[PDB]
């Protein structure tokens, strides 16, 4: 991605912790996630992706 959408996520990910610290990060590209991003601050895992096609089993689940 570009600079205007990454320097926010390198700063809005600092708004969570708030303990006098200097953050670090890794990036890995995966296309099987079709339309989102997953992130793991420690052991947190806020998932927003194309898993939400499998969550439409409830339409087929009576």
């Amino acid at each position: 991605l570009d600079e205007a959408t990454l320097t926010e996520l390198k700063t809005v990910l600092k708004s969570f912790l708030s303990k006098g610290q200097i953050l670090k990060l890794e990036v890995k590209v995966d296309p099987s996630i079709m339309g989102g991003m997953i992130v793991r601050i420690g052991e947190k895992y806020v998932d927003m992706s194309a898993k939400t096609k499998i969550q439409k089993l409830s339409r087929a689940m009576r």
Partner: protein, 70 residues
């Protein structure tokens, strides 16, 4: 994911444009719905659409008892 909420309704409306049953059946849905239509009649029975019950019953014949008495 309300952007996915609109995108599974809008490709449900496309399925509501139907002419003859299946859209991509081919030899698949034509054979399977005919294989299953036999099995609801195969071990069940041979039955028409509107034919009433047509039969006739005969009761037990009342024989007599011969009896010289006194």
């Amino acid at each position: 994911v309300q952007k996915l909420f609109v995108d599974k309704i809008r490709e449900y409306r496309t399925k509501r444009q139907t002419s003859g049953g299946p859209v991509d059946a081919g030899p698949e849905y034509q054979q399977d719905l005919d294989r299953e239509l036999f099995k609801l009649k195969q071990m069940y029975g041979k039955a028409d659409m509107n034919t009433f019950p047509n039969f006739t019953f005969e009761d037990p014949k009342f024989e007599a008892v011969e009896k010289p008495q006194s």
